[PDB]
Structure 1
Amino acid sequence: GPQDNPYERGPDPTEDSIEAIRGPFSVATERVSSFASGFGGGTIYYPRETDEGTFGAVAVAPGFTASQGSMSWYGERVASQGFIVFTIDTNTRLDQPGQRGRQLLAALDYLVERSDRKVRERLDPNRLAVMGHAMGGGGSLEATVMRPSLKASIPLTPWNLDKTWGQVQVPTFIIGAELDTIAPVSTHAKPFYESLPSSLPKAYMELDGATHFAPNIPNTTIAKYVISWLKRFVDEDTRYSQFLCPNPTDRAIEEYRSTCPYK
């Protein structure tokens, strides 16, 4: 209930609600020009209804050679659960993970400092998160080292040649694709996960049979746990702990690792 947490948004969740293509909030968009400073522009998805209060935000980066269109399905699927979701483009499609991390932070700065009134009035600037695919997932990790005040980080089939993330202090949920040949889980996702502190709230979800591009098309297993992670950590919403702990056992999941419970 709202009395025990001012950040709770939407009705009490069910497996149905977290798997839904659209959550309880209707969503509008604002397009941001690529000539915005610090990143390549993007699309801001935001909840229209303001009667429950302001929302946290997640900036969402694509991978190498890719654009925001590869991540577009996250926009309304996650925003309709009560989040501002900014699917960005990078300065160039060839940008590397550190560059992508800086651009994720620039996108969040844009929301806080430069966005239209419609967005700015709906945003709690104290509750921000990052998510990204592949090199953008590497970027999500990088952004958390740069800005430890982030509330959550979701590296999706992440790629990074930097394998060590022990200094990360932000709750991090890594999603791996079992059969990824571009960022193989053996040398990317798994070592990133194991390198994160064992006292950090964290999880690793590996998708059975999945390729590197699994995160680029609607995937209910990805969506329901992305939503739950952001709820738990951006909103401190413990109504969603039930889906994260104990570890999920969905058939689509090859394996799940976590530091449950998240005190």
Structure 2
Amino acid sequence: NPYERGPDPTEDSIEAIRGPFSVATERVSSFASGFGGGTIYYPRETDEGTFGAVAVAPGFTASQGSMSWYGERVASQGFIVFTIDTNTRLDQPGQRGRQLLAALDYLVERSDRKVRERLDPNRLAVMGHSMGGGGSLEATVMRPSLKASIPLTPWNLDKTWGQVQVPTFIIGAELDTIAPVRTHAKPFYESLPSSLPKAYMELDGATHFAPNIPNTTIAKYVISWLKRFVDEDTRYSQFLCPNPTDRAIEEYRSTCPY
């Protein structure tokens, strides 16, 4: 596997705040076409080759700042990470899906050459919080060539996702009162085809804003999911299959093995 980056992982290394790669940023103006601009986090070291990318959307009335902590934490594991702003704070999940795709296309077609020359444009993913998590789902239906999708305490009025053909990792918050897991996250997960590589992780005692706060449980499995599906890196299969049983996890569902 030519997409492998970084030293062989361990239980500790996937929990590390700072991964093996150093991180730089490039700022993208709000005048970008199709989305609200944002921040690109990328690995500085190039000697191991080019990297896949993940676009990251915030939720209803939230801004890119609610998702900033994913930038360095994930990019330092060898990913290009684009935390975006949406056109307006009131945009719906379908719009956020389009804007995730516009952000990824910006990376491929228009971003600074320091980013573009580090990018593998065929290996792209989406992630998002709340309505942005609904947007993660929407994006995969709009573009099945995506490698991975991580809806974080997702919110969406459409409850059926049987058309999704992109490996999808849904994270739920047990006590989420804004996108209740019983009417959003779990219906979404169960609607995904049983043949799709997929997973559900519910955080014990967490509220809607757990993904907006540095969370080692979220980070270690976000990292593992992107490694396994953006890089096809089966060194990380060990952490996803069988179901993780971290004390922090209320419930976990999966279609392991992948």
TM-score by length of 2: 1.00
- CA displacement at 1:103 relative to structure 2: 0.1
- CA displacement at 1:158 relative to structure 2: 0.1
Note the alpha carbon deviations across 1:187-221, whole angstroms, 9 max, x for none.
Answer: 00000000000000000000000000000010000
- CA displacement at 1:261 relative to structure 2: 0.2
Matched, 1:163 2:159: yes
SS class of match (1:170) = coil
**For residues 204 and 240 of structure 1, what CA distance do their matches in structure 2 show?**
17
Note the alpha carbon deviations across 1:31-85, whole angstroms, 9 max, x for none.
Answer: 0000000000000000000000000000000000000100000000000000000
Matched, 1:49 2:45: yes
SS class of match (2:99) = helix
**For residues 76 and 105 of structure 1, what CA distance do their matches in structure 2 show?**
21
- Which residue in 1 is equivalent to 2:195? 199
- CA displacement at 1:27 relative to structure 2: 0.3
Note the alpha carbon deviations across 1:125-160, whole angstroms, 9 max, x for none.
Answer: 000000000000000000000000000000000000
- Which residue in 1 is equivalent to 2:205? 209
Provide the identity percentage: 99
Matched, 1:151 2:180: no
- CA displacement at 1:7 relative to structure 2: 0.1
Note the alpha carbon deviations across 1:79-123, whole angstroms, 9 max, x for none.
Answer: 000000000000000000000000000000000000011000000
Aligned with 2:9 (options 10, 13, 23)? 13
Question: Could you list the runs of 4 or more consecutive aligned residues of structure 1 that deviate by over 4 angstroms after TM superposition?
Answer: none
Q: Give the length in aligned residue pairs.
A: 258
**For residues 172 and 249 of structure 1, what CA distance do their matches in structure 2 show?**
19
SS class of match (1:205) = strand
- CA displacement at 1:175 relative to structure 2: 0.1
**For residues 247 and 190 of structure 1, what CA distance do their matches in structure 2 show?**
16
**For residues 67 and 42 of structure 1, what CA distance do their matches in structure 2 show?**
10
Aligned with 1:130 (options 118, 121, 126)? 126
**For residues 8 and 118 of structure 2, what CA distance do their matches in structure 1 show?**
21
**For residues 60 and 14 of structure 1, what CA distance do their matches in structure 2 show?**
26
Unaligned 5+ segments in structure 1 are: none
SS class of match (2:246) = coil
- CA displacement at 1:236 relative to structure 2: 0.1
**For residues 114 and 137 of structure 2, what CA distance do their matches in structure 1 show?**
30
TM-score by length of 1: 0.98
- CA displacement at 1:15 relative to structure 2: 1.1
Unaligned 5+ segments in structure 2 are: none
